[PDB]
UniProtKB/TrEMBL annotation, chain A:
CD4-binding loop as annotated region, ranges: 324-334
Listed name of the protein: Envelope glycoprotein gp160
Role noted for this protein: Transmembrane protein gp41: Acts as a class I viral fusion protein. Under the current model, the protein has at least 3 conformational states: pre-fusion native state, pre-hairpin intermediate state, and post-fusion hairpin state. During fusion of viral and target intracellular membranes, the coiled coil regions (heptad repeats) assume a trimer-of-hairpins structure, positioning the fusion peptide in close proximity to the C-terminal region of the ectodomain. The formation of this structure appears to drive apposition and subsequent fusion of viral and target cell membranes. Envelope glycoprotein gp160: Oligomerizes in the host endoplasmic reticulum into predominantly trimers. In a second time, gp160 transits in the host Golgi, where glycosylation is completed. The precursor is then proteolytically cleaved in the trans-Golgi and thereby activated by cellular furin or furin-like proteases to produce gp120 and gp41.
Residues of the whole record sequence present: 30 to 495 of 847
Domain description: The CD4-binding region is targeted by the antibody b12. The 17 amino acids long immunosuppressive region is present in many retroviral envelope proteins. Synthetic peptides derived from this relatively conserved sequence inhibit immune function in vitro and in vivo.
Species this chain originates from: Human immunodeficiency virus type 1 (HIV-1)
Gene Ontology annotations for the cellular component aspect, listed alphabetically: host cell endosome membrane; host cell plasma membrane; membrane; viral envelope; virion membrane
An example molecular function term from Gene Ontology annotations: structural molecule activity
Length: 461, 136, 101, 136, 136, 53, 52
C-alpha cells in the first residue's frame, strides 16, 4: 500500500467491441473504371496503398466469424449498390406480348434448347406495330394456359413482377474491394490459420485496411477465393448440429474452365422511343451446348483429403458424398456468374463416390438463363443481354459449401450434400479474419504523482 | 518506442507492453483520432454520418479534458486521493506487470465515480481563483 | 451412437404432488422438453437444460447433470397432466405419460 | 444549483437565481452544448444540418475564448478597466439582486466594444512575448 | 495594423508586407478559418461536404498546435536549435526584406523534418512531469 | 421520338439569367486581378481579394 | 346484395388489362361511394367514370 493521487493520461490504446458503417477502398487503378462498375461503388477511391501492418506484442483477443457484423453490413451494401445502379436503366415491360414460337432452325442443323419466337412490338410511332423476332436462349418461357394451341408462350417476368435490363454502358465485375475503418476505429486481424471459426487468437495484427476481398457469387462452389496456407480447414457453428452449414477451404486451387461454344450474334430491337432492347438474333456456327471441364487427377485427391479432414472430427465414420439435395434451380445446380451470362450446371460428377480417407476429364452439362431473380430470391428481376461470340472463363475453385445428412443411418456411415445458401455465406468464407473495435482513450489511473499546488510548474513528481 | 518516433502502426504495439512503455510515446492516438483515411449511391452518405461521429467523439474527449483542468496536456495530475476499494493501492510496483487493456477491467466499474471527484478538484480551484483577500 | 432413453414409462399420481422424469443422452448437445395432452398441439416447457418457456409457472424445471438429465415437477394439479417428450438437436425420446389418480 | 457536480436539469434553475449561485455549478452547460441527445426521408438530413451547426457554434465560442487568453478556463479575469457608461460601476453591491437573463439586456449594446477592448488587452501580451533582453 | 483592429480584409494586406507588420495583428485568420460565410438539388449537399472539410482542417491545425505545447498561443517559442542548412541563420537581419509568401519556399522542404525535433522538444517534458522526488 | 423521349419545361419555373455570385467556402480566398491588359496568362501585379466574385 | 339492395353504392364492371398487354378481360368491383361522375355527352345514364 502507498499514498496515491488520481492521474489523467489519455491518448492511450484501449479497445472494445463495437459496430460501425465502414469505408470502402478499391485496389489499383480500378477506381477509374469504378464510376461505371457495379459490385464496385461510385467510387471507392483508394487514398493510400493499403494494407499497412504491425504485429501486436503479446496480445490475445477473442474472435467470432458467425456473429461478425461486417458480412451483415456488406450484404446491404451490395444489394443497395445493385438496385441503385440498375434503377436508371431502361425498363423492358412492354415486351410481354403473346409470343408465337417454333423450333429454332440453325445453320446445317437444329439447336438443342432454344425456341425461335416472333411477336408484335411497338414501333417509333405508338399507333403502329411490326413483327420482330428474337431467340430467347432458355426453354424456360412458360406456355400460356387456357388454350389448346401448344405454342402461345409468355415471358415469365410478367407473371409476378416487372423487370429491368442491365445497361451495357455499366459492366459488373469482381473488382477487389478493401475495407478501411473510419477515424477512431481499428480493424484487428488474426493470422493463425488453424483458427476453426471461434475462440482466442494469439497473433493479432492490426491493419489499416482489409486484404483483397472480391464479391464474386457462386452457389455450391466458391470461385477465386483465398486458400488456407497450410491445410484444408473445416468451419461450422457446431458440427454435431444437423442444421447449419460446413464451409471448406482447399489447400490447392483446381482450375475450372467453362465456355459457351455457340457463336451467338447480338441484335437490337426498337421497343420504344429511345428504349433499345438486346436479344440473341441468330446463331452462325456449330452447336454443342455450354459445358465445363475439371481435371479428375486433382479433384479426386482433393475430395480424399477433405474426407480424411472430415473423418478427424467424425471418428471412424466413412464419408459418402452424394447428389444435390433438391429444391430450387439456383441451389440444385452450380450457379456462377461470368462475362455477362449466367451459367447453371448439373454437377454431373462433383458429388459422387465414397472416400474413406484411409484408402481402403470431368464434363458438366450446363444450361443458361437470361432472366434471373437475385440469389436472395425475392425481389428484383433482370434481363441480362447476350454477349457476342463464344465465351471463355478461367477461374480457380477454392472452397466448397456442404450440409450434413441424418439420422438413423447405421452409425458407421455418414452422408454430405453440396448445397449453397445466402449471398452472405459466400463472402463470410473470405471475411473470417476481422473484427471492428473502437479505440477508447480511457479515464484515470493511479500514479506516484501528487497535487499540482496552485498549478505549479515542477520537475519529476 | 522512446522519445516519440513511431507511428500509429508503430506505437500500437504498446497495447500489450508493460504500462511503463505505454506511458511514453503516448501521442500518436491524438494524431490518429481526427481524420485518418477519411450519381449518389452507398459511397456518398457514409463519409458524413461517419466522419461527423468521429469529430463529435473527439470534441467530447477534448471537452472532458478541458473541464477537469487538463486542457492541452497529455499527462495531468489532479487533487483526488485514490480510495483503496477501487484498485490496488500500490500500483506503482504492479503496473510494470499489467498492460492497459487488461488494466481497464480492474477499474471499469469505478470509472464513473472518479469524474465526480475531479469535478470538485477543479471547482475548488474555481473558488480559490476569485474573491477579495489576495490584493495582488 | 446418438440414442436417447426416457424412464419411467407411465405414472399414476394424485394431484398436488411432485413427479420425477429422467432423460439420458450419449452426445454433447442441448436438451428440451415438450408437453402433450391427448390430441391437442404439444407445447414447449423448458429448453437449453434449465431455461423456462414463456407463460408457464415455476412448477417444471430440471438440472443438467452432464451425461444425464433429470426433470422434476412440483405441485402438479389435475389439469396439467399429459405426456412428456425429450429432445436433442432430431432425436425425440421414447416419451412418458402422467395420469391422475 | 449549488456545489460542484450539478446537472443540466439540476442546475438550469439558476437562470432566475441570484448571480452568486450561478457563479458556482457553472459547468454543465459546457458539458451539454456539444452533442446533447443527438430508405431516406424527412428523418435523414436533419441529423447532419443540425448537428454540424451545434458543433460550429461550440467551436466559435471556444475560439473566441481562446484568443482573449481564456482558453480552457471557465472563469477568466482580463486586463481591461470597466467604463462607467456600460453598467452600474458598483455591481459587486448589486449583482446579488440580478439574474443573468435580466442582466443581459443591461449590456446587450456594449458587448461588441468590450470584445474589441479584450483583443487589445490580449495582444499587448504579444509585444511582451518576444524580441528583447529578458535574460531567461 | 497595430493591436488588432483590422478585418480579414483589413489585415490580409500583410501578405506582401515586411515580416515586422505581419508579426503584429496575426489573429483574424484564426477568426476566419472556422466557418466564414458558410426540394434537394445542387445547392444542398455542398454546405456539408465543404463545411465539414473546413471544420476538419481547423481541428487538425488545433491538434497539431496542441501537441507541441503551443495550445491557445498565437506565438510560441520552443526548445529546438535552428540548424544551419534549413535557412539563413541570421534571419533577424533579413526578415525585414521578406514577406511570408516568398519565405515559405525557402523552408518548404524542411518543415516535416523540423516537426520531428519539435515533437521531442515537447515530449521531453513528459519525463520531467512525473515520478521522482521533487518534494513540493 | 426518332432518338430519345423528351420532357417539356413546366411554366411553374422560368428561364432567367439571374446574376450569380460565387463565394468561397471557409478557409479559402478567391483572388482577383484588376489589370485589364491581362491577355489570359501571366503575372498580375494588382491582385485583390474578395469574399465573392 | 344478399336478401336485399344496398343504399350507398353502385356495382361497376369494366375492361382491364391482363398480364399480357395485348388482351383484356371483364372484372367487377363495388366502389363504396356514390361519387363516380356520370360522363356527359351521352344519353346513356350508366357510363360512369372514376373522378381521379
Amino acid at each position: 500500500a502507498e499514498n496515491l493521487w488520481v492521474t489523467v493520461y489519455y491518448g492511450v490504446p484501449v479497445w472494445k467491441e463495437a459496430k460501425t458503417t465502414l469505408f470502402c477502398a478499391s485496389d489499383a487503378r480500378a477506381y477509374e473504371k469504378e464510376v461505371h462498375n457495379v459490385w464496385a461503388t461510385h467510387a471507392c477511391v483508394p487514398t493510400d496503398p493499403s494494407p499497412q501492418e504491425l504485429v501486436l506484442g503479446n496480445v490475445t483477443e477473442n474472435f467470432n466469424m458467425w456473429k461478425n457484423d461486417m458480412v451483415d453490413q456488406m450484404h446491404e451494401d451490395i444489394i443497395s449498390l445493385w438496385d441503385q445502379s440498375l434503377k436508371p436503366c431502361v425498363k423492358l415491360t412492354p415486351l410481354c406480348v403473346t409470343l408465337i414460337c417454333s423450333n429454332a432452325t440453325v445453320k446445317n442443323g437444329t439447336v438443342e434448347e432454344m425456341k425461335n419466337c416472333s411477336f408484335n412490338t411497338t414501333t417509333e410511332i405508338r399507333d403502329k406495330e411490326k413483327k420482330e423476332y428474337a431467340l430467347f436462349y432458355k426453354p424456360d418461357i412458360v406456355p400460356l394456359s387456357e388454350t389448346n394451341n401448344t405454342s402461345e408462350y409468355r415471358l415469365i417476368n410478367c407473371n409476378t413482377s416487372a423487370c429491368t435490363q442491365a445497361c451495357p454502358k455499366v459492366t459488373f465485375e469482381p473488382i477487389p474491394i478493401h475495407y478501411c475503418a473510419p477515424a477512431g476505429y481499428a480493424i484487428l486481424k488474426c493470422n493463425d490459420e488453424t483458427f476453426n471459426g471461434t475462440g482466442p487468437c494469439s497473433n493479432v495484427s492490426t491493419v489499416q485496411c482489409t486484404h483483397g476481398i472480391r464479391p464474386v457469387v457462386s452457389t455450391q462452389l466458391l470461385l477465386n477465393g483465398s486458400l488456407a496456407e497450410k491445410e484444408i480447414v473445416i468451419r461450422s457453428e457446431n458440427l454435431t448440429n444437423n442444421a447449419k452449414i460446413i464451409i471448406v477451404h482447399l489447400h490447392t486451387p483446381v482450375e475450372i474452365v467453362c465456355t459457351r461454344p455457340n457463336n451467338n450474334t447480338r441484335k437490337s430491337v426498337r421497343i420504344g422511343p429511345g428504349q433499345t432492347f438486346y436479344a440473341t438474333g441468330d446463331i452462325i456456327g456449330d452447336i454443342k451446348q455450354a459445358h465445363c471441364n475439371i481435371s479428375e487427377e486433382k479433384w479426386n485427391d482433393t475430395l480424399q483429403k477433405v474426407g480424411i479432414e472430415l473423418q478427424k472430427h467424425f471418428p471412424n465414420k466413412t464419408i459418402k458424398y452424394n447428389q444435390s439435395a433438391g429444391g430450387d434451380m439456383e441451389i440444385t445446380t452450380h450457379s456462377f456468374n461470368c462475362g455477362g451470362e449466367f451459367f447453371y450446371c448439373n454437377t454431373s460428377n462433383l458429388f459422387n463416390g465414397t472416400y474413406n480417407g484411409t484408402y481402403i476429364t470431368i464434363t458438366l452439362q450446363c444450361r443458361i438463363k437470361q432472366i434471373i431473380n437475385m440469389w436472395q430470391g425475392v425481389g428484383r428481376c433482370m434481363y441480362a443481354p447476350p454477349i457476342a461470340g463464344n465465351i471463355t472463363c478461367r477461374s480457380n475453385i477454392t472452397g466448397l459449401l456442404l450440409t450434413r445428412d441424418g439420422g438413423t443411418n447405421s452409425n458407421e456411415t455418414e452422408t454430405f450434400r453440396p448445397a449453397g445458401g445466402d449471398m452472405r455465406d459466400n463472402w463470410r468464407s473470405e471475411l473470417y479474419k476481422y473484427k471492428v473495435v473502437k479505440i477508447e482513450p480511457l479515464g484515470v489511473a493511479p500514479t506516484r504523482c501528487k497535487r499540482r499546488v496552485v498549478g505549479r510548474r515542477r520537475r519529476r513528481r | 518506442a522512446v522519445g516519440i518516433g513511431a507511428v500509429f502502426l508503430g506505437f500500437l504495439g504498446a497495447a500489450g507492453s508493460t504500462m511503463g512503455a505505454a506511458s511514453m510515446t503516448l501521442t500518436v492516438q491524438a494524431r490518429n483520432l481526427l481524420s485518418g483515411i477519411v450519381k449518389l449511391t452507398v459511397w456518398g452518405i457514409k463519409q458524413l454520418q461517419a466522419r461527423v461521429l468521429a469529430v463529435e467523439r473527439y470534441l467530447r474527449d477534448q471537452q472532458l479534458l478541458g473541464i477537469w483542468g487538463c486542457s492541452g496536456k497529455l499527462i495531468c495530475c489532479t487533487n483526488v486521493p485514490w480510495n483503496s476499494s477501487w484498485s490496488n493501492r500500490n500500483l506503482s510496483e504492479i503496473w510494470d506487470n499489467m498492460t492497459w487493456l487488461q488494466w481497464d477491467k480492474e477499474i471499469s466499474n469505478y470509472t464513473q465515480i472518479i469524474y465526480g471527484l475531479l469535478e470538485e478538484s477543479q471547482n475548488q480551484q474555481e473558488k480559490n481563483e476569485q474573491d477579495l483577500l489576495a490584493l495582488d | 451412437e446418438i440414442v436417447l432413453t426416457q424412464s419411467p414409462g407411465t405414472l399414476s399420481l394424485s394431484p398436488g404432488e411432485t413427479a420425477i422424469i429422467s432423460c439420458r443422452t450419449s452426445q454433447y448437445g442441448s436438451l428440451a422438453w415438450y408437453q402433450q395432452r391427448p390430441g391437442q398441439a404439444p407445447r414447449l416447457v423448458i429448453y437449453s437444460g434449465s431455461t423456462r418457456a414463456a407463460g408457464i409457472p415455476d412448477r417444471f424445471s430440471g438440472s443438467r447433470w452432464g451425461p444425464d438429465y433429470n426433470l422434476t415437477i412440483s405441485n402438479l394439479e389435475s389439469g396439467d397432466f399429459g405426456v412428456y417428450y425429450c429432445q436433442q438437436y432430431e432425436f425425440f425420446g421414447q416419451g412418458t405419460k402422467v395420469q391422475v389418480d
